[PDB]
Amino acid sequence: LSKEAERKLLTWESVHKENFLLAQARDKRDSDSERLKRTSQKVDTALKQLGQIREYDRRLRGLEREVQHCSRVLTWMAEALS
Amino acid sequence: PKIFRKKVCTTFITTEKPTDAYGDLDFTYSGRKHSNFLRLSDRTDPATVYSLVTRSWGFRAPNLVVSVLGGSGGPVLQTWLQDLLRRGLVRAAQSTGAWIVTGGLHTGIGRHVGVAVRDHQTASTGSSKVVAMGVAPWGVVRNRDMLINPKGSFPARYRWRGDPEDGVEFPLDYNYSAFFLVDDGTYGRLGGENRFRLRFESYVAQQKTGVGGTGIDIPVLLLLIDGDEKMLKRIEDATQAQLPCLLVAGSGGAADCLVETLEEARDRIRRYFPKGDPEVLQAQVERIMTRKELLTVYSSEDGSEEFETIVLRALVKACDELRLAVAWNRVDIAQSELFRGDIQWRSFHLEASLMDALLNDRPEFVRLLISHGLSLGHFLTPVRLAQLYSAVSPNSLIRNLLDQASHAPNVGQVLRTLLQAPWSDLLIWALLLNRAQMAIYFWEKGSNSVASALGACLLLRVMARLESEAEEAARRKDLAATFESMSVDLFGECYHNSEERAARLLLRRCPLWGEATCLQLAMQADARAFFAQDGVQSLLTQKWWGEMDSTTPIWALLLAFFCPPLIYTNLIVFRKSKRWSDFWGAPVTAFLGNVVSYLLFLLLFAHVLLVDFQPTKPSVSELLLYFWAFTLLCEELRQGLGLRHRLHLYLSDTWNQCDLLALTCFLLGVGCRLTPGLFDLGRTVLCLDFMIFTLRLLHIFTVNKQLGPKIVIVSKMMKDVFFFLFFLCVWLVAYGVATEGILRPQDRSLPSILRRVFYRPYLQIFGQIPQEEMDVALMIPGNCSMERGSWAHPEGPVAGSCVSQYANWLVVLLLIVFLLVANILLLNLLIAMFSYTFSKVHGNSDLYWKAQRYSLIREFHSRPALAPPLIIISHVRLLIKWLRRLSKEAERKLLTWESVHKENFLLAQARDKRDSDSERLKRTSQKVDTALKQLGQIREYDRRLRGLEREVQHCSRVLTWMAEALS
Amino acid sequence: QAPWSDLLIWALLLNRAQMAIYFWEKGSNSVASALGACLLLRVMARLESEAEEAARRKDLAATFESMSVDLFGECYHNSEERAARLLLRRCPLWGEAT
């Protein structure tokens, strides 16, 4: 074969190679075990978020009463306003 | 593909010259394709630029054009805008399908766009890249001398020395899909580029989106980031040209327009954002405030998210939005815009967006828009119906057929070349252009469903054999298998409810394209899996018994056949001068009359051939025989002619050919008998002819229920018998000539040695072994020859007269080795190959037999019910005639019954699909995915509450300081 | 300068699986290179001492045989004449051997 025959043939071959690899990766990505992996990781990082929900609630419980103790002190300031 | 892109575009330096820099463009980085560039004049038109890109290189038509401007931060831009440029611009340009037009050099935001495209192409397996196009002046490219050569279609190896920036020349980007180099002829300053940029933008915005065209005009939006004093000329020249804009928060160059939209302090604003030339910039920015219609603000937003609705917000403020949702192929926009209860959507907008969904291949919008409620008789004009056949790829099969049909809105001619409820026209439309989801959905709405599915399977296979490409033909065969399966399941439930009403459903006259019932539609379509059911085989049985009950045993039929006064008794129960035509009209009695008359033909042929065959003159019985074969000859001419295509229809089969063969040998036997010297020749030709008439009975009894498939299978075993004849003839020659040479007889005629080479061993494998003809110890010796050596005398007039005694133990060994290889190897291997083949082809031969069982029954149904010794009555009456030459409410009640069971079938299919485990696994994956979309707000609020809790607490510390100031 | 083939041969000799598959998926001339890969791994598998490394090389050689099957499957499924010219092309790897 000539040179431009080889170039046109091998680029034709590489085009069908690329479409084959995209089809393989899509069929692998949408299998059920790969979905089960990714949901397991997403719930895992969701419980990584919920550590902050546990840590903020006690921190907000102090912080809500801290202004409220100051609002009790403001009530004490209203008691000192007599 | 290089000379015209040298010639037609030009370059000026002033003299105007043809171009020299174009073609491919590789970089040192590996794993990527070749980029495309072009050296171009400035004083030229972008219409040939659009033709060069969209045709000569190969690029799709855009659905959105976004041009990104800004870049006051040279080395580093902020991470907030870097999050916007990474996600919120590129995900929209990759979902909708868009062209991001930027400057092709590194300076300004050219790097941050290019790094964002590289980040998005790395961060996902998106299997595509955003077509980020770049324009650049010719004068400011760093190393342009590796691009000059006018040769053509070449990878020009650009080089990065990594040289730092001077204000004279800049290097190229490396993440853009195409570059534009515009030759101005200055080599000195950036700025003489935006004339071609803004002209190319308004020319793209002038054209429209579609396949044959006929869509929205392409929306073009401008994105402004930080920028400088120079960009206000570009904003005002843009908004003069009727192009909308959008503004990020960013920094002061675009915040200048932000503050002027939120509301002399003007002269203040023009003297702390630009710091230079106040009053000219005040006139220009008030020119911007003349056109505040075409201006939006992107500040109080989520960031890198929900960008697409803000694009529609910009096109609404600068104002058809349902058509943009179809052109972007994004269902969620059109879905949400139909849930907005303010607009009172009118029908003509829905019909316009429906043509956008039908011309393009978007089936999901067709399902959505019809489920909203939309008329179809008011929809399908003959104009729009003419337009739907103009979205054809110009190198397909249907394009050739519509051109040839116009050669002699011509679909009745096209269907003739192959074969207000307007759903059927859309079904045929979707089947011709090879859409799968369109044709399935249009089947599921229309009525008359079983016959339409069988016509669909016929039409797709007929167009599959006529198809050029292997890929499109294979795709049409998979669609035809889908429609064959749906006709199977729909008739399954219709038969499972009501047997009589389904029986009237198949046998209904002319449902599609003239008089052809659903069985003949299944006949022509090779629908072997449709005849393989239980209900269809039951209906062929009830058709086979005529108007009797199909539970009558066979012996009662025989006893009534030989007693015609025993019709009128209680042995043949009827109703699934009246009972006479009831018994004799059924196809079992036409078949039974065929078999009885044909066995009496063979008995007459045997009585003539064996007992009385006078040599001189034909007797009475031989003349009855010649009259009989005259009638059978007229029968095969009637099944060949009842006008040259029909002779091909006769010649194509094998039992029309075989019955032709039996009659031609009959004529040769008579014509050889009647000449006086050739009597014994006809005496033997009629014997071979009697064999060919008796192998007729194997084809007659393929109709039967038990002997049916077992007769069909026998012909598929004949390859293994042919192998056995091969191996036997090799071994028969090998054995035969060896024992013939070892012992040489003295009677050496040619037929005698052919006998004792090929005809002794062939009978030896069937248990006939002659021992006295080839063994010294069983022969009597003697001096019976006149040659040197010892001899013997065999028994029998065929084994010769003398046999050599030399090495006769070797003949005994060749007899042992022959009996081993023949009677043990070959015969037991042949039983092995018949067991393997029969267990392999048993299922296919039942599918093939159950399909052919209809056409056999139809053959006996369309026969003149009279015996072949009496069939001259029918030939008389038809030669005389040759010398002269359900109700409506029944259909409505039946088809509504059919559509009720169709609806219950589709609900059961959708429920069984919805509760599969993979569909549950999809939906939970999406729900956790949106749950992590919620938990971004939990992360963002916690730091915001941490500031806000201490902010009141600092005020409570200030209140404590107020209590400290209360001392 | 497409030096992917030298990295392919490098990864096949040192018996890396993921290196050699990835270097196959970037380089050109793919069908003949997969068949040369299957030949080279089995020839080094018969010459191998340990049962474990020889068994691992046989599994890699079965992987490359499967990828040459599937790639030629789609190349033939598009165009019969052009795939016919793809197999019968003279000297793609190591002298005249189609």
* DSSP per-residue codes, B41-102: ESSS-THHHHHIIIIIII-PPPS-EEEEE----SS---HHHHHIIIIITHHHHHHTT-EEEE
Inter-chain contact C78–B471, Cβ cutoff 8 Å? yes
Chain B: nearest CA to C65, how far in angstroms? Answer: 24
26-55 in chain C: CB under 8 A from chain B: 26
| Contact assessment for residue A36 and residue B928, using Cβ atoms and an 8 Å cutoff | no
Inter-chain contact B928–A80, Cβ cutoff 8 Å? no
Q: Is the dihedral of CA B515, B517, B519, B521 positive or negative?
A: positive
Residue B35 to residue B17: CA distance in whole angstroms: 24
Does B172 belong to an annotated binding site? yes
Name the residue facing C29 among A10, A20, A21 (closest C-beta).
A10
Tell me how crowded residue B555 is: count the other CB atoms within 10 A of its CB. 9
Residue B348 to residue B30: CA distance in whole angstroms: 52
A81 inside 8 A of chain B by CB:
no
Q: After which residues is chain B broken (C to N over 2.5 A)?
A: 13, 263, 319, 408, 419, 576, 642, 885
* Residues of chain C positioned with their CB less than 8 A from the CB of B31: 26
Q: Which residue bears the tokens 């003239």?
A: B514
Neighbours, chain B (3 or more CB pairs < 8 A):
A, C
Q: Can you list the pairs that B577-585 forms with residues at least 24 positions away whose Cβ atoms lie under 8 Å? A: B582/B546, B582/B547, B582/B548, B583/B548, B584/B865, B585/B546, B585/B547, B585/B865
B924 inside 8 A of chain A by CB:
yes
Neighbours, chain A (3 or more CB pairs < 8 A):
B, C
| Contact assessment for residue C40 and residue C93, using Cβ atoms and an 8 Å cutoff | no
Q: Can you list the pairs that B860-863 forms with residues at least 24 positions away whose Cβ atoms lie under 8 Å? A: B860/B587, B860/B590, B860/B591, B860/B594, B860/B703, B861/B543, B861/B587, B861/B590, B863/B590
| Contact assessment for residue B468 and residue B397, using Cβ atoms and an 8 Å cutoff | yes
B935 inside 8 A of chain A by CB:
yes
**Structure resolution, Å:** 3.5
Residue B223 to residue B211: CA distance in whole angstroms: 28
Q: Which of B194, B192, B208, B273 is nearest to B240 (CA)?
A: B194
Inter-chain contact A39–B928, Cβ cutoff 8 Å? yes
Residue B91 to residue B94: CA distance in whole angstroms: 5
Does B118 belong to an annotated binding site? yes
How far CA B393 is from CA of B58, B397, B399, in Å, comes to: 16, 9, 7
Structure tokens at B244: 């909308």
Chain B: nearest CA to A67, how far in angstroms? Answer: 6
* Residues of chain B positioned with their CB less than 8 A from the CB of C78: 470-471
Tell me how crowded residue B182 is: count the other CB atoms within 10 A of its CB. 21
Residue B355 to residue B210: CA distance in whole angstroms: 11
Does B161 belong to an annotated binding site? yes
Residue B192 to residue B873: CA distance in whole angstroms: 101
- Which of C35, C67, C76 has the highest number of chain A CBs within 10 A, making it the mutation to test binding with A? C67
Structure tokens at B878: 């038809």
- Helix B437-445 with B423-432: angle, nearest 10 deg: 160
- Which of A33, A41, A52, A57 has the highest number of chain B CBs within 10 A, making it the mutation to test binding with B? A52
How far CA B28 is from CA of B157, B171, B846, in Å, comes to: 7, 14, 65
Residue B419 to residue B84: CA distance in whole angstroms: 59
Beta bridge partners of B24: B36
Taking the mean position of all CA atoms in its chain, how far away is CA B329?
23
Name the residue facing C82 among A6, A9, A19 (closest C-beta).
A9
- Identify the three-state secondary structure at position B469: coil
* Residues of chain A positioned with their CB less than 8 A from the CB of B942: 52, 56
Does B110 belong to an annotated binding site? no
Inter-chain contact A13–C31, Cβ cutoff 8 Å? yes
Q: Is the dihedral of CA B805, B807, B813, B814 positive or negative?
A: negative
For residue B220, the surrounding DSSP H or E stretch is: strand B220-224
B264 inside 8 A of chain C by CB:
no
| Contact assessment for residue B279 and residue B269, using Cβ atoms and an 8 Å cutoff | no
Q: Which of B769, B740, B771, B742 is nearest to B756 (CA)?
A: B740
| Contact assessment for residue B178 and residue B57, using Cβ atoms and an 8 Å cutoff | yes
Residue B532 to residue B521: CA distance in whole angstroms: 15
B949 inside 8 A of chain A by CB:
yes
Does B696 belong to an annotated binding site? no
Q: Give the angle subtended at the CA of B426 by the CAs of B420 and B429, to the nearest 5°.
A: 140
Does B145 belong to an annotated binding site? no
Q: How many CA atoms lie less than 13 Å away from B672 in the CB half-sphere? A: 15
Inter-chain contact A73–B963, Cβ cutoff 8 Å? yes
Q: Which residue bears the tokens 């529609």?
A: B312
Name the residue facing A16 among C78, C85, C89 (closest C-beta).
C78
Does B549 belong to an annotated binding site? no
Q: Give the angle subtended at the CA of B401 by the CAs of B397 and B405, to the nearest 5°.
A: 175
C25 inside 8 A of chain A by CB:
yes
Residue B199 to residue B205: CA distance in whole angstroms: 10
DSSP state of B564: G
What is the DSSP pairing of strand B220-224 with strand B65-69? parallel
What is the DSSP pairing of strand B297-298 with strand B245-248? parallel
Residue B965 to residue B497: CA distance in whole angstroms: 92
Residue B653 to residue B418: CA distance in whole angstroms: 23
A67 inside 8 A of chain C by CB:
no
Inter-chain contact B925–A39, Cβ cutoff 8 Å? yes
Inter-chain contact C85–A20, Cβ cutoff 8 Å? no
Experimental method: cryo-EM
Structure tokens at B32: 């990527």
How far CA B337 is from CA of B239, B297, B330, B331, in Å, comes to: 28, 22, 12, 10
All residues at 6 or more sequence positions from B323 whose CB lies less than 8 Å from its CB, including other chains:
B215, B216, B352, B353, B356
Residue A64 to residue A66: CA distance in whole angstroms: 5
Tell me how crowded residue B74 is: count the other CB atoms within 10 A of its CB. 12
| Contact assessment for residue B648 and residue B665, using Cβ atoms and an 8 Å cutoff | no
Q: Give the angle subtended at the CA of B796 by the CAs of B790 and B800, to the nearest 5°.
A: 45
Residue B176 to residue B36: CA distance in whole angstroms: 9
Chain C: nearest CA to B30, how far in angstroms? Answer: 8
